[PDB]
Amino acid sequence: SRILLNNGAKMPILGLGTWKSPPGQVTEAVKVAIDVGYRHIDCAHVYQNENEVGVAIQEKLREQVVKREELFIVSKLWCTYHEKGLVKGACQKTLSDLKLDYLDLYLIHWPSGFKPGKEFFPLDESGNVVPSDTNILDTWAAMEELVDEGLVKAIGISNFNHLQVEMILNKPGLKYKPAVNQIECHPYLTQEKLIQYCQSKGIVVTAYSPLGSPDRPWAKPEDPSLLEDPRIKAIAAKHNKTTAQVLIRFPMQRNLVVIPKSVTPERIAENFKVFDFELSSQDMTTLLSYNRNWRVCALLSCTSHKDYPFHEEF
């Protein structure tokens, strides 16, 4: 149920995602999740719902359902706060919203810094994202300070390519190695090279968008649909499981952490019922065979940013 991180802490391999969970629904989602056994919640300031996630956690702590030490709460430093001077306040805002005194894991959400200011996606008049003059290593050093001050127990990265990870690993005077790299991963984007890289370096990989993010706001009707893939439905039927259950179990059997999102109580419970069956070797081979290098998350307006991660092969 949990994987050991480099700081000695254990991270639950199944967590609840919260991107696109409206504040109207995420409090109930998190309450239900905790009731049915989730102990890991994946959050971010940019998801605009951390206050409501926080309400749910506070309530369940107060109800004596769970103790804080049993929860594993992750959040992420948004791109507009990469300047060394902005990092601590960004973390403290997340902590205040979540009503917590520490995070279990805090990630650099994307390797790119954006122009500081109120807008999460500052654009120029021609639609290009406006970068900031920040660099990965200075942002990393700021993240390390959060560990040293007790705000966070572990730090990591998200959407970093292997060269960007290597930059941090090779930093003279590195204080903390990244514990986790959180990346998009599912049968249409199987990430074999980056997973082998990270796992060889002692970095745990978390798979995001494991169901293919059908609710992503830029979906096009001609896009591939993992949950509707008849090939994956057939593997699910053979196990008397749903397609979502197969898609969640798949990364678990690759020694990945996985964070499916739902706000629908029946699905939150369904998605956790993945510890009672095993995909066969042939199932795993078949699912890996569906790779198409297809990404849910890769914003066009960011493709000229100097730190855009997806020009590299991996």
Ligand X SMILES: NC(=O)c1ccc[n+]([C@@H]2O[C@H](COP(=O)([O-])OP(=O)(O)OC[C@H]3O[C@@H](n4cnc5c(N)ncnc54)[C@H](OP(=O)(O)O)[C@@H]3O)[C@@H](O)[C@H]2O)c1
Ligand Y SMILES: O=C(O)Cc1nn(Cc2nc3cc(C(F)(F)F)ccc3s2)c(=O)c2ccccc12
Where is the binding site for substrate, in residues?
109
Based on the shown chain and the rule CB under 6 A, indicate whether residue 309 belongs to the binding site for ligand X: no
Residue 311 tokens read as: 């020009």
What's phi and psi for 271, nearest 5 deg? -70, -20
Q: What is the rounded distance in angstroms from the CA atom of residue 71 to the CA atom of residue 61?
A: 10
Residue of 47, 81, 106, 208 with catalytic role = 47
Question: Looking at this protein, which amino acid is placed at residue 153?
Answer: K
The reply on whether position 244 binds ligand X by CB under 6 A is yes
Q: Smaller CB distance to ligand X: residue 254 or 261? A: 261
| Shortest Å distance, C-beta 79 to ligand Y | 5
Q: Which two structure tokens, joined as six digits, stand for 215?
A: 């609710």
Site string for ligand X, 129-168 (x = CB under 6 A): -----------------------------xx---------
Task: Indicate if 102 belongs to the active site.
Answer: no
Q: Is 229 in the site for ligand X (CB under 6 A)?
A: no
User: Count of CB atoms within 10 A of residue 211's CB?
Assistant: 22
CB of 75 to ligand X, least distance (A): 10
Q: Which stretch binds ligand X (CB under 6 A): 128-136, 140-148, 195-203, 205-213?
A: 205-213
* Contact of residue 18 among ligand X, ligand Y, none (CB under 5-8 Å per partner type): ligand X
CA 16/CA 260 separation, integer angstroms: 6
Q: Rounded CA gap, 304 and 151, in Å? A: 33
Q: How far is the CB of 270 from ligand Y (least distance, A)?
A: 23
Give start and end residues of each alpha helix (H) in 16-131: 23-36, 50-62, 84-98
Q: Give CA–CA dist 227/260, Å, rounded.
A: 12
49 near ligand Y, judged by CB under 6 A: no
Cα separation of the two ends of the chain = 28
Rule CB under 6 A: say whether 110 interacts with ligand Y: yes
* Beta-sheet pairing, 10-12 with 2-4: antiparallel
Instruction: Give CA separation, 32 vs 192, 259, 264, 274, 288, in Å.
Output: 34, 15, 9, 17, 32
Residues with Cβ < 8 Å from 196, sequence gap 6 or more? none
Of residues 73 and 246, the one with the C-beta less far from ligand Y:
73
Pattern 135-164, ligand Y, x by CB under 6 A: ------------------------x-----
Helices (H), 239-297: 243-252, 265-272, 281-288
What would the two tokens of residue 101 be?
């005194």
Separation between Cα atoms, residue 7 and residue 177, nearest integer Å: 9
Pattern 80-119, binding to ligand X, x per CB under 6 A?
-----------------------------x----------
| Binding residues for ligand Y, total number by CB under 6 A | 17
Q: Is 46 among the residues that bind ligand Y (CB under 6 A)?
A: yes
Q: Which are the catalytic amino acids?
A: 47
List residues near ligand Y by CB under 6 A.
19, 44, 46, 79, 109-112, 159, 297-299, 302, 305, 307-309
List residues near ligand X by CB under 6 A.
17-20, 42, 109, 158-159, 182, 208-216, 227, 242, 244, 259-264, 267, 270-271, 297
